[PDB]
């Protein structure tokens, strides 16, 4: 199924 | 998460599982207070990108070179784009597109 990542500022 | 007054700019990293960077295409979603989940863009490992509609040339996906991470460049930002931002692979609707971990973008007038 999804997966999901992991969203942060750069 | 990230805020900027309206004409900025702010870059987004989504770091995900390597087996999943490699192989699969990589979305980039968001949802905006009290709207739903919208795809945004995707990358593939060979760097081909698609855009929505709405993103007009102001976002752009790349991938680093040696980390698994793809970056969401954002460009000339307007406050409708004020919204939390995920990233997800392998998604069965576009709404399981924001069932993780996302980051606050706001974007004030």
């Known amino acids: 199924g999804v997966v999901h990542g992991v969203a942060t500022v750069a | 998460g990230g805020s900027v007054q309206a004409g900025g700019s702010l870059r987004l990293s989504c770091t995900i599982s390597?087996?999943?960077?490699?192989?699969?295409?990589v979305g980039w979603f968001r949802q905006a207070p009290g709207k739903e989940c919208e795809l945004v863009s995707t990358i593939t490992p060979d760097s081909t990108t698609t855009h929505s509609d709405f993103v007009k040339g102001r976002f752009t996906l790349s991938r680093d070179n040696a980390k698994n991470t793809v970056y969401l460049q954002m460009h000339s930002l307007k406050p409708d784009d004020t919204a939390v931002y995920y990233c997800?692979?392998?998604?069965?609707?576009?709404?399981?597109?924001?069932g993780g971990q996302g980051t606050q973008v706001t974007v004030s007038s």
């Open positions: 997800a692979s392998r998604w069965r609707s576009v709404s399981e597109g924001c």
């Open positions: 390597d087996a999943i960077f490699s192989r699969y295409a």
